[PDB]
Amino acid sequence: FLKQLSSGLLLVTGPLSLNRVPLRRTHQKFVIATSTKIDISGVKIPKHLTDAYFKKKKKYEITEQRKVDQKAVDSQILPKIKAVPQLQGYLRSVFALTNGVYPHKLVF
Amino acid sequence: MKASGTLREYKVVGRCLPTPKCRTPPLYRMRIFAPNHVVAKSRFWYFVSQLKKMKKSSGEIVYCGQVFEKSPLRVKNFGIWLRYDSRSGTHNMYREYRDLTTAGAVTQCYRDMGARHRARAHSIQIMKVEEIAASKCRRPAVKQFHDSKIKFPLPHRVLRRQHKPRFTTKRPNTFF
Amino acid sequence: VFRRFVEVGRVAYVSFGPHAGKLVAIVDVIDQNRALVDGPCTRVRRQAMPFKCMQLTDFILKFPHSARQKYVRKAWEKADINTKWAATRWAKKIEARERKAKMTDFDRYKVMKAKKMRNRIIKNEVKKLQRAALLKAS
Amino acid sequence: QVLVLDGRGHLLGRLAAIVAKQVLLGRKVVVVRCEGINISGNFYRNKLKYLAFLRKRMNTNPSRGPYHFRAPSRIFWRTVRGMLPHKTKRGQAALDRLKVFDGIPPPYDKKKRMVVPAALKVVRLKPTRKFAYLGRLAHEVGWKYQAVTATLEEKRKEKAKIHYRKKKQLMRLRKQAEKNVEKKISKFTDVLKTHGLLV
Amino acid sequence: SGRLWCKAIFAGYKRGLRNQREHTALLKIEGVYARDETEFYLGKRCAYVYKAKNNTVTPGGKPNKTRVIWGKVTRAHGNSGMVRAKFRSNLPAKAIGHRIRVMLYPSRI
RNA sequence: GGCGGUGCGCCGCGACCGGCUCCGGGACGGCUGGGAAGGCCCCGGCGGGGAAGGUGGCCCGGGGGCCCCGGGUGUUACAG
RNA sequence: AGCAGAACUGGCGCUGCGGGAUGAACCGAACGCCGGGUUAAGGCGCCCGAUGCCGACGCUCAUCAGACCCCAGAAAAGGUG
RNA sequence: AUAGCCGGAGCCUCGGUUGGCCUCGGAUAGCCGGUCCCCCGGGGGUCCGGUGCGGAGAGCCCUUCGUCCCGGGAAACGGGGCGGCCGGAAAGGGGGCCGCCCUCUCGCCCGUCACGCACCGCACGUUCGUGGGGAACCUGGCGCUAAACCAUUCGUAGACGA
């Protein structure tokens, strides 16, 4: 999670190398909030990207501005998640429920 | 009177209304065991109407209050006298209990008498509860706890929380 | 035969109730299914607590059958029950349960990754000894 | 996904009441060793309880009367059927999920059997009371395969003992395996102890 | 790559002994057996997945044979972990004792 | 293109406000016998007493053999 | 006598609903069509919604045990259970 | 005895499900596992450890984002390819072992490099699924060239059937 946008959606972005997830909006209700935090206090989010930047325009091809902003933000995050051991493997993994696993019983 | 939950001891006093004949009537105090004070004053007028020429219309409540246990952390032996009713005839008893509070022993008395003689709480008229020493006890069930070196295990521990593991693998162990 | 006995001064573990998970020491026995008990050092005020919600331990500290709360605390500190209880295998597997209970999803992933190679070495170690046994069996 | 419940030491009505609720919830329940089911009360009480049940038959045509089942598995199947709405479509669909067996079939011998602690004699009955075995009760009223099942159940008793004694030796090598290798597994061991798995 | 919903069994409708109210469904979610553990599942969206003969459309995919009845978890029922749910259309009685899914995306955490 | 009105083809989602409900978490205060009890200050200090569910100490018995279990006297003695 | 004849009041007749396995008279409560919530009487092992409460205290073994107003079955007497 | 068995793709219909646990016996005023110094042909006995079971179902096993390189830890016995061999009868498994001609320390855990429609917030997603059944299409191999009934007769049988 990066920041709270204007309309209430969450600007959430895992690294594209690990999660294969771009700078993408996500509603806060359909979100499991894991109590695992990194320090993004010292990153520089671009001000030009906003809710209107992620608004659907009208076949989707990736613009070169999206690619530049993808590596502009990931370059600040990816060194920081490498400071926490086994965090990149945690992000590459997928979340699922197995036998005997109950979300109400476990904490996260 | 419904012996609901644990009982409470209420100290209710009362007197007759002032009359042209009598300036100030005498004051009568009693020990009333009841769940609340509303049923305690009703039970107060029940016994007062038997002993004296008193009714609730001609009388009044001067002070209705609850007295607390003076030593609730001291284990004590209580002697309790009974005036219950049976299906045929009425009988008196003396019963011994071992409890921390006087009201708890009366509560233990009400649940014990209904268990043994099937006597309801409306058929039971409590009269006297008194603290007695351990050396003056009579019933051997109470006197068997008067031991400075009392020692006993828990032989057959009936296991609870039996349904949280409703289906399990290992046979449960009823021994600890 | 029985090895644990309800008696004056035995340290007990509370099963359920508002004081569940704490230690407590028997002072006196009130009734057949209820006893007067006092956990002066474990935030358990002097009260009556039945045999239903207590698991009795193999710890005995000596004081008279109706000693006040001052002497129970002094006997608790003299015997030093709190340090010895943490060294008991009973409490070591008790405290591991909330460690599993508070285990974070990130902590859940690291346990799963560590469990993989830990079982890999043991299975590889076990594999070396099954084949080593059969040469020794022939 | 299939409940394999061992019937030894289980009370007839307490097990049947829990099975009937689980079966109605779309769960397939297989009850095994129905000869080990035992009933509270003395043996002579339950015999006339079943003998007077035998007397209840249709006068005009006993072939249409109550079908008195003598096998321990079918006796337990009968008391579950009386705990179910078997006159409806969903009651009969439930009974298809129930499967009772005397002894242990070779489909279910090499499987772990679940135990219901709430439906147990040692939990729900006082030690001074008397109980009656359904296996003894069945053969004493018309079942012909008590000694038959006893020998076949005897046959698998040491066959599982061979598996179990091999199982102990198999994991005896496993427990001894860590004893040589703590120096290179302590990295994985300590993180499994901080989260409470080996403490 | 795996399951994202908790397993629940449609035990039956909210009912009396001789009167049933089939506009409210009772759910038995696996793993919950007490009233105080049902608080997490309150407000979660429940769905009954089933398949039919005629092909119907699928959002974001080729039209399939599967169909759903959407609903939400309203409030806890009973004492032993049961819970009530309300759907847009009333559940058919063919689903009695069958598996339905309760999802987590109506999350309060 | 902007403003007002009506509506979205179908399947859906979200946000805020108001009404009616069920539930939870915090903090504040009154009354009592102006709580009862209870904790600390050597047993709070001093003096005077009492017995028992009898702690030291004494005697007898038994188990190894230096602690435990019983019975009796006692008044704090190395517990109360 | 579930018989016949009276007094007060309430019901059925004229009235459905929840409960008592069923039920003219019992208990609760009377009715336009619905959604949410909460109850009465009754209940909460399964049928059958609800205790899968770490329910409290005791009593009771029946080789005819016992289990809820109406209400559907029992007496005198006796028991070193 | 049967005028089907082995192995490839598409179409209708029936539906449920969304990782597996491969197992001692048995007690409940008692158990469990190891040492066997002891005694006999597996049991008994002793000892040592746990016993609110941690050689714990409050549990165990597997874990799957994928591809490309490089380095570290393990591994050299190991991962995967066909024939036999036996162990299974209460309603019986593709279970294990011997050798095979090819396969890599690729398997896995840590860390580097780079890539993968980044479908621009949204639902039945994700398996068991080469699921069961049915027609038709495939390719070849291996094969088999039967019975029942009616009719007639019999009369150990019979209202008619049988």
Curated annotation (Swiss-Prot), chain A:
Top-rank lineage group of the source organism: Eukaryota
Residues recorded as bearing N6-succinyllysine in the entry: 44
Compartments where found: Cytoplasm, Cytosol; Cytoplasm; Rough endoplasmic reticulum
N6-acetyllysine: residues bearing it: 59
Subunit structure: Component of the large ribosomal subunit. May bind IPO9 with low affinity.
Family named by the database record: Belongs to the eukaryotic ribosomal protein eL6 family.
The protein's role, per its UniProt record: Component of the large ribosomal subunit. The ribosome is a large ribonucleoprotein complex responsible for the synthesis of proteins in the cell.
Protein's recorded name: Large ribosomal subunit protein eL6
Organism whose genome encodes this protein: Oryctolagus cuniculus (Rabbit)
Lineage: Eukaryota, Metazoa, Chordata, Craniata, Vertebrata
From Swiss-Prot, chain C:
UniProt entry keywords in alphabetical sequence: Acetylation, Cytoplasm, Isopeptide bond, Phosphoprotein, Repeat, Ribonucleoprotein, Ribosomal protein, Ubl conjugation
Coiled-coil stretches: none
Highest taxon in the source lineage: Eukaryota
Keyword match Repeat: yes
Molecular function, one GO term: RNA binding
Entry-annotated residues carrying N6-succinyllysine: 84
Residue(s) carrying Phosphoserine: 138
Crosslink site: Glycyl lysine isopeptide (Lys-Gly) (interchain with G-Cter in SUMO2): 123
Quaternary state and interactors: Component of the large ribosomal subunit.
Name of the featured protein: Large ribosomal subunit protein eL14
UniProtKB/Swiss-Prot annotation, chain E:
Any one GO BP annotation for this protein: translation
Residues where N6-succinyllysine is found: 62
Alphabetical list of Gene3D superfamilies matching this protein: translation elongation factor selb, chain A, domain 4
Keyword Ribosomal protein: yes
Subcellular location: Cytoplasm
GO cellular component, one term: cytosolic large ribosomal subunit
Segments forming a coiled coil: none
GO molecular function per UniProt: structural constituent of ribosome; tRNA binding
Keywords: Acetylation, Cytoplasm, Ribonucleoprotein, Ribosomal protein, RNA-binding, tRNA-binding
Main subcellular location of this protein, as a coarse class: cytoplasm
Residue numbers bearing the N6-acetyllysine modification: 7, 62
Protein family membership: Belongs to the eukaryotic ribosomal protein eL33 family.
Its job: Component of the large ribosomal subunit. The ribosome is a large ribonucleoprotein complex responsible for the synthesis of proteins in the cell. Required for the proliferation and viability of hematopoietic cells.
Name of this protein: Large ribosomal subunit protein eL33
Organism (species): Oryctolagus cuniculus
